[PDB]
Design a protein around this ligand. Structure first.
Ligand SMILES: Cc1nc2c3c(ccn2c1C)[C@@H](O)[C@H](O)[C@H](c1ccccc1)N3
Ligand SMILES: *[C@@H]1O[C@H](CO)[C@@H](O)[C@H](O)[C@H]1NC(C)=O
Ligand SMILES: *[C@@H]1O[C@H](CO)[C@@H](O)[C@H](O)[C@H]1NC(C)=O
Ligand SMILES: [Mg+2]
Ligand SMILES: [Rb+]
Ligand SMILES: [Rb+]
Ligand SMILES: [Rb+]
Ligand SMILES: [Rb+]
Lengths: 987, 254
């Protein structure tokens, strides 16, 4: 926009430029034309988001890619088998079809979650159109903000949100709330003098979204809409493209192993196919069945429910997440960049400390009033509380008696609201209390006096004397004080106290707190009888020799849970940095307050002042902390930044632009960090997008920063973050527990094929039957592994190294595929030969027998028993071969699901029945297993039939062998974790 | 890096041996004469010779005037019947009991039992003599209809089981067909049942009958269903069409 040289112009120059009047405002006609020219004074949302392209994305990436390829291969195989002629190849279709179906349905489940969460977030939104008091043709009236046009004339006051970007023309004690654009937690003086050349730092521009605290100003609208400082800062954040989530990156690497193995097996057994005497055509269709057999059919569905479960558990703590992948990120996270104002602090002036009875008292600045409050038994307390309750012009909006006292809306301003919310908390019912003491004279914030003074008749009629109350800048109260309430008496304001007051004023100011002096004088009912007319102009009342009551100082206090939460994260090994736009003194204050900076750490500037040495000589390595302001951040190149970044562990950036915030996250990510940013304002939108997870404050958050966030704390409870880590850490461990289970069953599915390929035995396992394994029986058990409790103290571990610690590592698979898969293959093959040897066919006979077996012409083929059956009668046996191999898997899966409960612990310790949801799932597993076999009509529908009751028992020793063998593994890894066992045999 | 390699070997051979033990268990488990379960043998199937298959099942179509079309049909009938010759079937005994034949004990070299005998003789004209075209050159083909063997399966003391062949529809279209089977009335004698083993009766052969088709029109597609008739036979199973009945298409051209 044209913002660079708006404020530096003259008012004679501006009204030529925008063809307006600084007095009379924009003509009604032109202001209407302009709106057409420039469009509405609002911000265009990220359009171009059809409902049908939201779903298209849900079915891409990772397993999505693999499963589509795997599905496509099934169709090419059907073409090759329909070229040379293959019957009941219905299997090729059903497989390819079930692949695409899992992909689609997973995509829909994700769609509702992303849809459902966004409606939850939408309902915590305000839909009342902000208004603007405008002047057009010399008439002031109320209009909607969006209707303002560049050149308009506007006004605002206490409580008015700033309608546009306004060049200030004339301001009467106007201060305003830049906490969203800049970090600034102290209100900002607005005047028409040109404070600076950067529109960001000059004090004659009200910014587009900002909030007037007190006073009044007028000005010209200079940029409306997307052209504002708000406007161009979110154009920025659009231009920020966020990186792929950690959880997704794990799953993509995971696929490079499935794919990696697929092909090697394909190639070797395609080589074995050619070498053993097959046509290239059939060697290649086998090659294809091999790669496709490595793709897990259900892993995509089993994974995303696990995410949905924790996201549900997280939703329940007012931590609503937008996409399912972000549920894991916090557990992976190792750095947290954090905004100060609004996120860490409450952004609301609270009374922090008070000086009376020659002692400073610390108030309870928690919003839930969970902190420690101060000594209110003092006689001087009751009095200082009267002065600050009477001499307060502000008021609560009506009908908020339900809502908590800090969260109430209050008219007026914060110097005075903090005093009002304070009184309601400490005294209670302040505005009704001060109706007992009527008001006869008043002086608001004055020029010549520079103090606020009012006179009141007492409550009870037995006391006809009047009471004068004065508040104001602390020295300007003391100069008009000859007395001081101390410890039950009213002492003269001698040099002991004059020194003692100045030390306390400068003491509470050193914390950068807006502090005010308070005092009272009791007018005698002799000189001032009931009804004495007071004159403001002439000085008939006294404004001197008053009795000093005390000091009260207010500040921007941290949110209640915040100091606790930061510590709990650091013990999780998560580096906390603070990136804020506020000034350093405030920045270091809060960073001490909450935990970013620990008791005892000093910056290089601290050593230089304690040792009284120039900063250059100080060894930076000796500084556990450091502050860096933004105006000096740019001076260092990135090689300088990393130096300092890894020198001082308790880092704080102060006075930093949104882009700098982005730079920092980028510099951290560039050094291999899973970095999370935690934000409220529009100076975090860009920062929040680039972060691996962007956390928004549910209530205090600006729209952009919520819109650029992965996660949202609906109640602003920052303690949610610490749970987010714990859950994210949990499922990562529980996912690799649950993944490692589901992919063991691939090998005993493929071994039947490989053997049917190589040894040419009659087909032991059918496609229609692996689909029931992968997509019917083993899902409920798999997802139940998301219910396991932490085996170790997860919250005490360092954040997993993304380079070494991986969801699926080279010992994870090699254990699950080749070792337990082998015990399952031998379990399946042992029941395979038993099935046929007991049914007439001896094993030696089965070797090579397949061609005649599948042959549709041989209707009298002899067993090893001499007997001759037909095709269909053989088929029905092969269905049992399928069916007995199927239950041979299931009896190992029940042994398998329990095996995965703990990677490094034992079930005699933890409990076989530890969690309910796995056990209820195991019972489900067998139930369909018994329904699939002994339901009538099963053999024709699916290749399943009533097994004999003893073939159930055949694989049950192998299940025990699985039990024993891992139990001793995970009994030997934990109890002797020297080197060998943990390396090859830990997953 | 080598140390890991051995481990997979140790692991596999353990499982290998563990599996190598179960095979040895399973071979000693199972009987060598009587089927361990035989769960799909509630009713037997019926094969047909000559077995010449079309796109779906058995289709047999030849030209009488053209020796080539039907030569290969007898050139499978004759081949099949080489074991139905006395020269290679002398390793058993003649059974004229005309009733079921139960051997409780094994009496032949290497602890074996006695088998019945059946030679082309029984199929009078359809034996290769006097007609080596087995009816085909005449336009009256003979089809051999043999049932599969099931250890200790019994079709019934009542009478002999017997084949019956006919078409599917075409009642009014032409005459119902007449076949003369050999043996007459188309019956398998009772003394052949039951089967007892490939090791129990090595020199054993299935009894069969033949079907000399008389009625079949020339140059017309017909369909015939040779279905066995006994009590312990079910020729009505829709999942296995070749179960106690065999269908075949047959067109004889001139
Ligand atoms: C692991 C496994 N794979 C199959 C399989 C079939 C039967 C059993 N199978 C088993 C136990 C056939 O019906 C199919 O041709 C099918 C196939 C799939 C992709 C490419 C080529 C062929 N592959
Ligand atoms: C049968 O064969 C003879 C000689 O091969 C031929 O002349 C006659 O037309 C054939 N009949 C049919 C229907 O093809
Ligand atoms: C079979 O041959 C005999 C003599 O060899 C003859 O009497 C009889 O009619 C023939 N059967 C048929 C069906 O032609
Ligand atoms: Mg902020
Ligand atoms: Rb698979
Ligand atoms: Rb206190
Ligand atoms: Rb993000
Ligand atoms: Rb019957």
């Amino acid at each position: 926009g044209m913002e660079i040289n708006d404020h530096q112009l003259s008012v004679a120059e501006l009204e030529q430029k925008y063809q307006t009047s600084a007095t009379k405002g924009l003509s009604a006609s032109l202001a209407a034309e302009l709106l057409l020219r420039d469009g509405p004074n609002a911000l265009r949302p990220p359009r171009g988001t059809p409902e049908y392209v939201k779903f298209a994305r849900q079915l891409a990436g990772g397993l999505q890619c693999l499963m589509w390829v795997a599905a496509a291969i099934c169709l090419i195989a059907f073409a090759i088998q329909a070229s040379e002629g293959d019957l009941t190849t219905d299997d090729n279709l059903y497989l390819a079809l079930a692949l695409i179906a899992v992909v689609v349905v997973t995509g829909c489940f994700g769609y509702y979650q992303e849809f459902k969460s966004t409606n939850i977030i939408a309902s915590f939104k305000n839909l009342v159109p902000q208004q603007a008091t405008v002047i057009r043709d010399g008439d002031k009236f109320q209009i909607n903000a969006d209707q303002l046009v560049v050149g308009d004339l506007v006004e605002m006051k206490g409580g008015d949100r700033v309608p546009a970007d306004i060049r200030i023309l004339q301001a009467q004690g106007c201060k305003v709330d830049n906490s969203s654009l800049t970090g600034e937690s102290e209100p900002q003086t607005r005047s028409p003098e040109c404070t600076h050349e950067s529109p960001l730092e000059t004090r004659n521009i009200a910014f587009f979204s900002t909030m007037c605290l007190e006073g009044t100003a007028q000005g010209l609208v200079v940029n409306t809409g997307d052209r504002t400082i708000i406007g161009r800062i979110a154009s920025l954040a659009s231009g920020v493209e966020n990186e792929k989530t950690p959880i997704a990156i794990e799953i993509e690497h995971f696929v490079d192993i499935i794919a990696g193995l697929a092909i090697l097996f394909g190639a070797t057994f395609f080589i074995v196919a050619m070498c053993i005497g097959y046509t290239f055509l059939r060697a290649m269709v086998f090659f294809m069945a091999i790669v496709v057999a490595y793709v897990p059919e259900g892993l995509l569905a089993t994974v995303t429910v696990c995410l949905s479960l924790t996201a549900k558990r997280l939703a329940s703590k007012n931590c609503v997440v937008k996409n399912l992948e972000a549920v894991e990120t916090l557990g992976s996270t190792s750095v947290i960049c954090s905004d100060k104002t609004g996120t860490l602090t409450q952004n609301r002036m609270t009374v922090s400390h008070l000086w009376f009875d020659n002692h400073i008292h610390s108030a309870d600045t928690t919003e839930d009033q969970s902190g420690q409050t101060f000594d209110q038994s003092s006689e001087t307390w009751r009095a200082l509380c009267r002065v600050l309750t009477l001499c307060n012009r502000a008021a609560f909006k009506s009908g908020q008696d339900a809502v908590p006292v800090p969260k109430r809306i209050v008219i007026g301003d914060a110097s005075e609201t903090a005093l009002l919310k304070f009184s309601e908390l400490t005294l209670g019912n302040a505005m009704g209390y001060r109706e007992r003491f009527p008001k006869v004279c008043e002086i608001p914030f004055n020029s010549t006096n520079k103090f606020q003074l009012s006179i009141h008749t007492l409550e009870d009629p037995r006391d006809p004397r009047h009471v004068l109350v004065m508040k104001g800048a602390p020295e300007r109260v003391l100069e008009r004080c000859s007395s001081i309430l101390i410890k039950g008496q009213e002492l003269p304001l001698d040099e002991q106290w004059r020194e003692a007051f100045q030390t306390a004023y400068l003491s509470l100011g050193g914390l950068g707190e807006r502090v005010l002096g308070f005092c009272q004088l009791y007018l005698s009912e002799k000189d001032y009888p009931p009804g004495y007319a007071f004159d403001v102009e002439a000085m008939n009342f006294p404004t001197s020799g008053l009795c000093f009551a005390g000091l009260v100082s207010m500040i921007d206090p941290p949110r209640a849970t915040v100091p606790d939460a930061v510590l709990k994260c650091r013990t999780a090994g998560i580096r906390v940095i603070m990136v804020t736009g506020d000034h350093p003194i405030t920045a270091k204050a809060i960073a001490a307050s909450v935990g970013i900076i620990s008791e005892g750490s000093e910056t290089v500037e601290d050593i230089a002042a304690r040792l009284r040495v120039p900063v250059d000589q100080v060894n930076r390595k000796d500084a556990r902390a450091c502050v860096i302001n933004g105006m000096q951040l740019k001076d260092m190149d990135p090689s300088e930044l990393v130096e300092a970044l890894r020198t001082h562990p308790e880092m704080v950036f102060a006075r930093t632009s949104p882009q700098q915030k982005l730079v920092i996250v980028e510099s951290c990510q560039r050094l291999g960090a899973i970095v999370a940013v935690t934000g409220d304002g529009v100076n975090d939108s860009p920062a929040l997008k680039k972060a691996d997870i962007g956390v928004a404050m549910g209530i205090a958050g600006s729209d952009a920063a919520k819109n650029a966030a992965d996660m949202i704390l609906l109640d602003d409870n920052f303690a949610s973050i610490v749970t987010g880590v714990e859950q994210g850490r949990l499922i990562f461990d529980n996912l690799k527990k649950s993944i490692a289970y589901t992919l063991t069953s691939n090998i005993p599915e493929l071994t039947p094929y490989l053997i049917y390929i190589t040894v040419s035995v009659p087909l032991p396992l059918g496609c229609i039957t692996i689909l029931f394994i992968e997509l019917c029986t083993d899902i409920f058990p798999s997802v139940s592994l998301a219910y396991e409790k932490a085996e170790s103290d997860i919250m005490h571990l360092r954040p997993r190294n993304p380079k070494r610690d991986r969801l699926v590592n080279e010992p994870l698979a090699a254990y699950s595929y080749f070792q337990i898969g082998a015990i399952q293959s031998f379990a399946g093959f042992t029941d395979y030969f038993t099935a046929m040897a007991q049914e007439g066919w001896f094993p030696l006979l089965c070797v090579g027998l397949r061609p005649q077996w599948e042959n549709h012409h041989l209707q009298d083929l002899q067993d090893s028993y001499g007997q001759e059956w037909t095709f269909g009668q053989r088929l029905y046996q092969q269905y049992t071969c399928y069916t007995v191999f199927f239950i041979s898997i299931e009896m190992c899966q029940i042994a398998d699901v329990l095996i995965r409960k703990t990677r490094r612990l034992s079930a005699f310790q933890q409990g076989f029945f530890r969690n309910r949801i796995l056990v209820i799932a195991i019972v489900f597993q067998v139930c369909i297993g018994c329904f699939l076999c002994y339901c009538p009509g099963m053999p024709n529908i699916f290749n399943f039939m009533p097994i004999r009751f003893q073939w159930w028992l055949v694989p049950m020793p192998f299940s025990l062998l699985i039990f024993v063998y891992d139990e001793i593994r995970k009994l030997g890894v934990r109890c002797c974790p020297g080197s060998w066992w943990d390396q090859e045999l830990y997953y | 890096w080598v140390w890991i390699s051995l481990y997979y070997v140790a692991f596999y051979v353990v499982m290998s041996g563990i599996f190598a033990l179960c095979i040895y268990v399973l071979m000693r488990t199972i009987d060598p004469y009587t089927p361990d379960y035989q769960d799909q043998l509630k009713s037997p199937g019926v094969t047909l010779r000559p077995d010449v298959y079309g796109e779906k099942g058995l289709d047999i179509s030849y030209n009488v005037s053209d020796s080539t079309t039907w030569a290969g049909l007898a050139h499978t009938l004759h081949r099949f019947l080489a074991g139905y010759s006395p020269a290679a079937q002398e390793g058993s005994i003649n059974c004229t009991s005309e009733k079921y034949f139960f051997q409780e004990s094994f009496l032949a070299p290497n602890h074996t039992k006695f088998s019945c005998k059946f030679t082309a003789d029984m199929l009078q004209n359809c034996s290769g003599r006097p007609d080596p075209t087995f009816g085909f050159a005449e336009g009256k083909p003979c089809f051999i209809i043999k049932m599969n063997r099931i250890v200790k399966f019994l079709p019934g003391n009542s009478t002999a089981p017997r084949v019956d062949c006919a078409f599917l529809d075409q009642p009014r279209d032409g005459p119902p067909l007449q076949v003369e089977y050999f043996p007459a009335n188309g019956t398998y004698s009772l003394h052949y049942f039951p089967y007892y083993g490939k090791k129990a009766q090595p020199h054993y052969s299935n009894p069969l009958v033949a079907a000399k088709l008389l009625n079949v029109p020339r140059n017309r597609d017909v369909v015939i269903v040779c279905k066995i008739l006994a009590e312990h036979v079910s020729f009505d199973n829709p999942h296995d069409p070749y179960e106690g009945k065999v269908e075949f298409k047959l067109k004889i051209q001139k």
